[model samples]
Target: WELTILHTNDVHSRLEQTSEDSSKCVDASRCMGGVARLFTKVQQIRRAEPNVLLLDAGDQYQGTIWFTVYKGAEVAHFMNALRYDAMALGNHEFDNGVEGLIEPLLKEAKFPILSANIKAKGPLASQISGLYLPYKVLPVGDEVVGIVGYTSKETPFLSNPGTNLVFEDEITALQPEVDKLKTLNVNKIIALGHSGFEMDKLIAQKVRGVDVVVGGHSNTFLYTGNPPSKEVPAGKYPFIVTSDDGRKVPVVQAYAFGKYLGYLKIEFDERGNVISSHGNPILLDSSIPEDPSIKADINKWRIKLDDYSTQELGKTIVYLDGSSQSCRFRECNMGNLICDAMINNNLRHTDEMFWNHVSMCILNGGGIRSPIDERNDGTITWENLAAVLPFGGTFDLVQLKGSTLKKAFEHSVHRYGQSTGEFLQVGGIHVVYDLSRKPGDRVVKLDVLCTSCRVPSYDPLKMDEVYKVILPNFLANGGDGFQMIKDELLRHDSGDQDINVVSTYISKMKVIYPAVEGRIKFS
Candidate 1:
């Protein structure tokens, strides 16, 4: 007998199909991904196949207005409609705190939510017990498949899972569970979780008895040949990893936002080892029709969100590029816009006068998720902006010694050439970095345009004086590996969301296009 695991990772609470042009809308048959279409496709397969297991590798929370407003209620409803067999916890599920994680997985979702590594202690313990199972033996026909789940141990630093929950290394948490499965006479094991692609491959290579890994958190799009859209493929689908003991384990991650449905067919041998596994990520584009039954309700929800998502904001003369391929690796126009917008808003609102007193703003490079796809005369709307700055936050100001400021710049360039969020996009400071040098020593020259300087001028960073700097709450509180600031400075919360600040800034600019201003230089 064979098993078909229908999997998805990082379906970040996008309930309705986005317009053909990547903007949210009221009507468009060609819009991509709705509960109706996703469910319709899965149901079609279930009708013809046997021993099928539907799985989601976490991150069904956060993103889009539906989730921003209704939160897990939206995700839980649509997910329950799809009838997923099991799920792995994702980092974004904890974006809002414990309420987001517990509300959906423990109380709502019919299936077992699994994550072996994270331990909820004290107040959060009782909730994670039977409600969130680490591993569950899912029986398909006469066969039993052991599925062990794991969450990113980087949750504390990445998002807000809070201090009470302890996330251990997945490799350490998974081995003993696999051993436990062995004692139960279960041979086939699938490691499922929200860790990035690298962690998933490491789990497959180092851990024994893991036949496959369904992953999320990195939003990796792996395809065999040519990609379906403008999106680039990072690796071949069903990326195989050679275990230390010489067995091959297939790892897969469907790109985030439910744009594609991952289909993997695996044939297990008599000993329950995966002998063959292959499949493609089916693009849920206009070609597939949304389920009428499911579409009606999704459309109803779409109507409620139309007031914000459907309003036309303005036009962008130049494209604001924020795709992960751009923002996380190098400075992009959108990063500049976001960073500039953050500072610009501070200037307009800050109590200080002349020169505005908000010298520079730094945006987490990874926060820019989607691009401002300004086609059709570069027209944009609130929905378009929402897609770009999905996990919004407020800006804050703090005083830091130039010494620690230099350390922050050093930390920013530490992940040069890597697609990481730690890379900083700035609006006030001019930095020159030499990637040739080792990390923590890469910043060749760090200069600041002081917020309080009478005639603002770029001055060589002096280790003695304290300077005011602007940053998001995440970084100010040490998100995205910004522990330097978290340890060095404590700032006042702006009491506003980043999206609002960014929106106000855009409106003030009134259709002006921003660019890469040479703030960051690489030699």
Candidate 2:
């Protein structure tokens, strides 16, 4: 039998197109994807292929103005319209805690939300009953095929899923599901979920029964021929992975933000084992026409965005670079701007007499999504502001021993060369790291500065002394591996949302120009 899988992961709630640009739209393509193009493209694929299943690996939530405005509800509205077969839960689904995620996402999904690795007991487990399945048996043409799905086990640390949820090892959790499918005599099995490129490869190699793996997270681009000018292809499409049992498992992923749609065709033998396969991710540029039905829904939802777009929040003479490619590796101007706002978050409150309590700020580069697009007149908008910081996290004031802060810095530069999101972006501090050394020993020098002090004080980080710093509650709760900082005894949330805090700072600046001043250096 033959089956075609139409998949997407890490779309990140980008349901509208701002304009026709190189990144937004390819040459002669009118506008980039907003689900309208996906709607039309999926229909075209269905017309051409007889056995087809539309799947999403995870992270359909967060990012873009649509998510920031309507949260998970907008995502459900669009996905339900597409009639997706199944969706893997992404770590960002917990951005607003477990309740906000399920209230909109799980309840709204017409299809099953699959995750075998998670253990949610008590009322939470009873509530989601059959709604969340480990694997679903679907009839594709003549045969029943088993589709098993799960998210990254690192969800709790990466986002905010609360204490009730416990995630197990990815490779270990998948084996039982594959065995159950085999017991039912379902020979064809597909592993679909999120966990960056490396984890996807592992699942394909280690999992005995999986014939294919559709993956997401890490926003990686994998292609056979030449990729778009801006993208670097990781490998050939449907990169083959040889499993322990000598079976071949195909792994594939579409780059994030609806920039592409993954299409793979797999032919199975009589016993349900994959015999052959071929496919690639189609770039969703303007050349593809948008479906009228999806466009109508988009128009209705887009009407709400106009109100949030025109709020003239401050101004910037230079563009604030917050692109994931830039921020994840080095010190970005957006990181500097945001960290400054976080520091000011406390300073603007309370009395100046208590200002000495605050010192430096630490921010994860992954927190900043889009860049501050250049405006000819230097006027900033609420749209761009929210786009840059879409994941809603509140502010927190924490006191940590300088020694503990040093440990956190060590974690920041842990995966030095790789574009790991855990990379640190700073404000009011200088760090000199030697990439030649191992991860734990990378932070050779760290200095904290007191910008609000009666006399600005710059001192080397001391293990014996304590310092007050500002950061997002996400990081404070040990998000992005800042566990040492999270372990500190004193931490408090200021009740103000991060978006409000940032917008407030931007509105007051009126005129802002930030530059990369060697705040973070690597030798």
Candidate 3:
């Protein structure tokens, strides 16, 4: 029997249909994936295909106002409506900690949340242990397909899972699960989880029994077609990975924000090994119609959220580019806007002594969650602003010696173009990096803005001189590998959350136009 897999990953709570850029949908006839549209397409496939499985690789949390308001309650409702068979936990799923996932996992979900790499410790384990299964046995037709799941081990550093849970490397955790499934006479195993495309490849390479890999976290688009939308595919759909024992494992991920649905149809041999597989990520564009039932529910939710989602904060003359690909690797305008907002908002509360020493802010590009698309009236709604800065936390101030600053900068780009969240986006500093060199030696030339200097100009950083800096609480606490900063940290709480700060700045500015000013350069 042939099995069909319909999947999505890193949707990031895009309950409403959005523009091609994943911004709020203005015109229905011109919009992309929404829960309604996604449901419609899945129903279409279920009607046409014989044996089907609906799976999500994870990150169904944070991004749009739907999550911001209802949290995972709305997420659970929609996923149940879609009839998802299994899901992996994405890093953002833990943004609010263990309790955040509790309400949804125990109360609402009809399907199992899988992550062999994750373990909940203490009394929390008793409440949530069996819910997050290591492997789920799915029966389809006369065949039984075993699905094993794993999450990125970087959850502790990238999100707020708290101290009660433990995470292990994907490959290290997966092989044992696959072996355990085999002892039960289940041979066809599919590795489904939120590990990135790179990790998926490594799993395919090292793990012995996994026949296919469906992934998330990296928001990688893998397509084999002429075109679909503006998103360029990172690789071909079902990119084949050759295992050590000569088995071929197909790895795939649909690009984020519910924009594309991954479709994979495969035939299994008598031994339960995948013999043939083929599919593509179908773009959920304007052509597909929304399911009426889901659309009605969405309307009701919107009515409840109008006070926050529909409120206009300000306007922008240009698109605030916060795409992970752009912001994580280079200087992006949205990054600039956020760092600028932190600087602008803190000025009124900070004393002259502090203001004179501090005009700089460094926010991790990963902290920027969504892009702001320019509209006809140049209006930016509150929903748009929240989506851009979804993680809410007060700013923290610290004084760092120039040497310590250099250490922080090195850690930011240590992962280079891998879409790591540690990459820095700044407000008042300029630095040139040479990536062709080793990671620790990448910072070739650096300069800091002297807010206290005679003309408030840029000056070469002095190794021994101390400079005051403002950063998000996450980074200030050594998140995203800023260990050097954390060890020598001094906390001066700004007591203002990022979402409010940016929105306030936008309201005051009326119409803002921020740009990439070469604050970060590559030699």
* Candidate 1 RMSD to the real structure: 11.4
Q: What are the lDDT figures for the candidates, one per model? A: 0.79, 0.79, 0.83
C-alpha root-mean-square deviation, candidate 3: 11.6
The ten-residue window of minimal lDDT in model 1 covers: 345-354
Locate the minimum summed-lDDT window of 10 residues in model 3. Answer: 348-357
Candidate 3 regions exceeding 4 Å error are 309-337, 340-523
lDDT of 1 by residue, 1-523 (tens): 5999899987766677765433454567567876788988999999998889999998887555676557688777888899999998887677667777777556988888898998878966875667788899999989999999999886664455767788899999999999899999998898999888999999999988899999987778899888887667878989999999899999999886788899999999989988899998988887888899898888777676777666656678987888888777666788888777766645432223446555777788877878887676777777777777665454666677788788888888786777878888887788888988888898888787865655777888898887777777678868887777878873332223466556657666778588887888877
Predicted model with the maximum lDDT: 3
- As a whole number from 0 to 100, the lDDT of residue 329 in candidate 1 is 66
Looking at model 3, residue 92 earns an lDDT score of: 73
lDDT of 3 by residue, 323-388 (tens): 999999999999999888877754532224434446788999999899988875888887787788
lDDT tens digits, residue span 284-325, model 2: 877788888788889888777787778677789988999878
Clashes of 2: 3
